[PDB]
Amino acid sequence: SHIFDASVLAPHIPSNLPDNFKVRPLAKDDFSKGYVDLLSQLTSVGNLDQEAFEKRFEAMRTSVPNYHIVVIEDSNSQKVVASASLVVEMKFIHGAGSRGRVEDVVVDTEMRRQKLGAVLLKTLVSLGKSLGVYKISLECVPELLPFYSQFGFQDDCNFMTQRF
């Protein structure tokens, strides 16, 4: 069970990259392949157990637009070592267009500088373009502007937040 149809993803996955990496949608059994621990490296996972994972996974799976949560399993360890998400918001502006957002980009602490992050970003950009979104966006610290610039992004206006 994949969180979105792998056939949607197949055209956008870059050609290079070694085996033993599989780029694919998030699978329901990725909880048992270390997905929470990977997400912990990005921010707090709070109280997410398998059961809450599975319920959320199903809620996302049956969403349209899909949650395009794309992961990289390293076949050796049977672990998920990178994740990045493209989520899409429907709009009335731009001819009832849609806006893409890249979220929750994480590459496992032991597996950086192996182009895992670049592969995910290239894949999501290609996917978003193909899905027809008029604009794709993301949020990062200024030190990552040159990272994401590589994939066609450029610094835009202010981003404001508040937490509860």
Ligand X SMILES: CC(=O)N[C@@H]1[C@@H](O)[C@H](O)[C@@H](COP(=O)(O)O)O[C@@H]1O
Q: Are 61 and 4 in contact (CB under 8 A)?
A: yes
Residue with Cβ nearer ligand COA (26 or 116): 116
Among 45, 65, 98, 103, binds ligand X (CB under 6 A): 103
- When binding is defined by CB under 6 A, the residue of 102, 120, 127, 133 that contacts ligand X is 102
Residue partners of 106: CB distance under 8 A and separation at least 6: 38, 39, 41, 42, 82, 83, 84
- Could you give the CA distance from residue 129 to residue 63 in angstroms, rounded to a whole number? 20
91 versus 115: smaller Cβ distance to its own copies: 91
Give the one residue of 66, 85, 114, 123 binding ligand COA; rule: CB under 6 A: 114
Contact 101, 86 (CB under 8 A): yes
CA distance 123 to 136: 13
CA-to-CA distance for 17 and 68, rounded, in angstroms?
A: 20
Among 135, 145, 150, 152, binds ligand X (CB under 6 A): 135
**Contact string (CB under 6 A) for ligand X, positions 138-157, x = contact:** xxx-----------------
Task: Report if residue 83 touches ligand COA, rule: CB under 6 A.
Answer: no
Residues of the binding site for acetyl-CoA: 113-118
| Positions in the binding site for ligand X (CB under 6 A) | 42-44, 93, 102-105, 135, 138-140
